[PDB]
Amino acid sequence: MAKKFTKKGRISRSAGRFGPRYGRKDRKLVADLEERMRAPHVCTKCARPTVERIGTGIWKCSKCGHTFAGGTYIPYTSVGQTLLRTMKNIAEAK
Amino acid sequence: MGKRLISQNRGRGTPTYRAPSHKYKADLRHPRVDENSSLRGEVVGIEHDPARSAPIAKVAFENGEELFLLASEGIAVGNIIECGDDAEVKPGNIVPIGNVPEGFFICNVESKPNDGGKFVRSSGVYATVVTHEATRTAVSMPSGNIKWLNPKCRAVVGIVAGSGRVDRPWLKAGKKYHKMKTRAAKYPRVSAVAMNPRDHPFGGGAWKHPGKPTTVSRNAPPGRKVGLIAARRTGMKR
Amino acid sequence: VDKSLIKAVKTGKVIVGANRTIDAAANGSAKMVVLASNCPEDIKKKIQATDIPVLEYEGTSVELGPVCGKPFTIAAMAILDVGESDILAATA
RNA sequence: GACCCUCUUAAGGUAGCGUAGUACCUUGUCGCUUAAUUGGCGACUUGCAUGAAUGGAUCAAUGAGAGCCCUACUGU
RNA sequence: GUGUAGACAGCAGGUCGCAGUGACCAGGGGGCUCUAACUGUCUAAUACCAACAUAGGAGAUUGCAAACCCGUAAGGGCUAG
RNA sequence: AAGUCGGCUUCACCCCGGGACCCGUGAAAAGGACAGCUAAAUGUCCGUACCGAGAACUGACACAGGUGCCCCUAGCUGAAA
RNA sequence: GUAAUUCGAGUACGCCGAAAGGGAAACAGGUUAAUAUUCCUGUACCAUUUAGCGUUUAGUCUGACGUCUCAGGGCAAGCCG
Ligand SMILES: [Mg+2]
Ligand SMILES: [Mg+2]
Ligand SMILES: [Mg+2]
Numbered sequence A: 001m002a003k004k005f006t007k008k009g010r011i012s013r014s015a016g017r018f019g020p021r022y023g024r025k026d027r028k029l030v031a032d033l034e035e036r037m038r039a040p041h042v043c044t045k046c047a048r049p050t051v052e053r054i055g056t057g058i059w060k061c062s063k064c065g066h067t068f069a070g071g072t073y074i075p076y077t078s079v080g081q082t083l084l085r086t087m088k089n090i091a092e093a094k
Numbered sequence B: 001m002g003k004r005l006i007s008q009n010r011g012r013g014t015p016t017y018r019a020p021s022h023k024y025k026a027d028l029r030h031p032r033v034d035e036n037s038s039l040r041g042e043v044v045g046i047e048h049d050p051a052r053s054a055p056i057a058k059v060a061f062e063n064g065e066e067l068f069l070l071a072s073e074g075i076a077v078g079n080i081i082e083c084g085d086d087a088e089v090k091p092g093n094i095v096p097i098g099n100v101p102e103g104f105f106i107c108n109v110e111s112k113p114n115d116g117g118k119f120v121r122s123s124g125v126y127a128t129v130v131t132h133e134a135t136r137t138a139v140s141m142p143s144g145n146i147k148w149l150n151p152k153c154r155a156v157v158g159i160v161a162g163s164g165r166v167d168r169p170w171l172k173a174g175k176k177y178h179k180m181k182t183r184a185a186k187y188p189r190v191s192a193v194a195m196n197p198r199d200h201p202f203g204g205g206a207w208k209h210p211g212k213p214t215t216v217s218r219n220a221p222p223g224r225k226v227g228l229i230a231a232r233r234t235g236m237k238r
Numbered sequence C: 001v002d003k004s005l006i007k008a009v010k011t012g013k014v015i016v017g018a019n020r021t022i023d024a025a026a027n028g029s030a031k032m033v034v035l036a037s038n039c040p041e042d043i044k045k046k047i048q049a050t051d052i053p054v055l056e057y058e059g060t061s062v063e064l065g066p067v068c069g070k071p072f073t074i075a076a077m078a079i080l081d082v083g084e085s086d087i088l089a090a091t092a
Numbered sequence D: 001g002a003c004c005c006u007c008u009u010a011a012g013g014u015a016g017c018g019u020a021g022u023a024c025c026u027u028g029u030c031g032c033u034u035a036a037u038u039g040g041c042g043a044c045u046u047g048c049a050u051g052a053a054u055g056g057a058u059c060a061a062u063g064a065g066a067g068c069c070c071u072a073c074u075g076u
Numbered sequence E: 001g002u003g004u005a006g007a008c009a010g011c012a013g014g015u016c017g018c019a020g021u022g023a024c025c026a027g028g029g030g031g032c033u034c035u036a037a038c039u040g041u042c043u044a045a046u047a048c049c050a051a052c053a054u055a056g057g058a059g060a061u062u063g064c065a066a067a068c069c070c071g072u073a074a075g076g077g078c079u080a081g
Numbered sequence F: 001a002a003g004u005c006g007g008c009u010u011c012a013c014c015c016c017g018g019g020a021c022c023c024g025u026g027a028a029a030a031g032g033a034c035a036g037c038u039a040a041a042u043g044u045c046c047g048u049a050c051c052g053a054g055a056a057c058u059g060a061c062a063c064a065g066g067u068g069c070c071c072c073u074a075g076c077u078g079a080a081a
Numbered sequence G: 001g002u003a004a005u006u007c008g009a010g011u012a013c014g015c016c017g018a019a020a021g022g023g024a025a026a027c028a029g030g031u032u033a034a035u036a037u038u039c040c041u042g043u044a045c046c047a048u049u050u051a052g053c054g055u056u057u058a059g060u061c062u063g064a065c066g067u068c069u070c071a072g073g074g075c076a077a078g079c080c081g
């Protein structure tokens, strides 16, 4: 499907561009964060996966055109999720 | 006179320690509103601010003047903001902290009324309203302390955007170098024990050791408060 | 509301898409027009201007699509003639 | 050279490493490396005067860094 | 043979010399240790190193009319934070 | 003195468009465009030679250094300046 | 403000700061011992004022922008018959 994931070429992932440098821990952290960033995120108006990162904390929908501010590396954060959940439950209880 | 230290050089304000002000987009402050007024406005664009490494919003108000604003998370181009006393509680509006319910998150809080906002401004931080007495309200600051603010203070509801900025390690001197070009900080910094006895209280010797205790009292004169300034404790937790 | 659409797509006249629904509504042959919840507000102007009954759909167009039999997304759909279906009974 | 005692003017070195870039005695003793080695490596070690962010041990890739050995090469 | 082309790749036979990247150009290689992780900086004119820097780890002060600092003062740096 | 024609290629130059990257986000103002057309008149001031370097600069020199390799360069061999 | 200034930070109003940033408009040939998009021949172009003949949309666009990588078109140089 993607590039050759041979018997070896499978652990580094996107951190394979650093070669033999910076140690195992940092490379693993950067790699995992990169697979989270490259994910197919979902829109809020469209409800179609079209969201990609334009800048530091700026996101946009390719089809929908919608622009919004979010996380630096991921569109939606857990704390914002909790705020939405709590405020929406309070509103809906009224 | 053994040479002055880096802190005193920053005090003088030489060009090496001055912020490159012309790079920054604009100052962030709350809209100025007279007594018993409520102005609205809808976002026109979302923009990057080089002075904080976080997004900011451009909003055009009904009078005509547009202002950059500290962008809370979720702000999108098109939504209208209703800053004023009569605003409802929603993510984005600016309302007094006296009539904010307990448990709600806020940010860009002011010290005294009509300051524009001074607390809770870096990426992904937020504060909480705890209690509402008649004369004050206690909010838990992101540091972890309780602060007693005036009920007639303004603060945008939500949390500051850009959350998670420090989950990505530098892993190079080059990337951190590039960040420091748009700040007043100096990069890189020499360590005190590697200097000469003219330059620092810790310098000198045939081997690199502090020589004297690193904890310094709070009453030490300028040019000597180097190290652990008036520490209450030291070491990790055993 | 949900099982009637199965027969509306199986039998009778239906058209999928915003523009053909606009044409059917203006022509008036479309007895009823069905819309998804999160559709753009630019479409509701015609659906109110058109006398045709406006059947809401609680879901979003993204899941409206697959239930209608099409993998893609459906914003506004019209049924010109029901035939062997009773979605109109849901609307009128 | 244990362990009961000590000298305990606060306590008396845990993991590790160890003749070290730190070992005065000293060219310390044994093995591999040479016809022959105050050398290099490995082992022991009663450590004049090792030791845990005065950071300990080890470490792939990198080095106009510092030692020793093999092969090819040569007027050294 | 591929290709729109420029060109590129491959084959069969013959043949010369001591020698066919024939001149020019153009890595010697391997093994065992100590040391610094690495790329970087350094005594312009005797010291390019194991020294300095670095990412990583930890500690301390401060809720902003703050901590730290410059000025005799008026006022300022950090701070469009 | 001929002064007619075809073909191949084309950078290191011009136009146009796409993609990726950023805990870097990559100037401002004068000026110009959108209502101009015709006619005559006006367009002041300063520089302009020559060198720009193994002899015109700087190092006391007609100095093997430095400023300037700052910007450009034909045929063959060859990946190639 | 300072004992005081020719000294000192800030604020308001001005004004300067790029012969490699922005930028209204010209090319070929000839002529001298030494100057040439400057002089001469030919063919052009752009502004400000005056007079005549008409008119705004007046708020937007442009000037006006990073590093890397790639397709397409064109062309000076080059080569072949
Ligand atoms: Mg001293
Ligand atoms: Mg020897
Ligand atoms: Mg090194």
Ligand SMILES: [Mg+2]
Pocket (backbone or CB within 6 Å): none
């Ligand atoms: Mg060091």
Ligand SMILES: [Mg+2]
Pocket (backbone or CB within 6 Å): none
């Ligand atoms: Mg000027």
Ligand SMILES: [Zn+2]
Pocket (backbone or CB within 6 Å): A043, A044, A045, A046, A047, A050, A061, A062, A063, A064, A065, A066
């Ligand atoms: Zn969308």
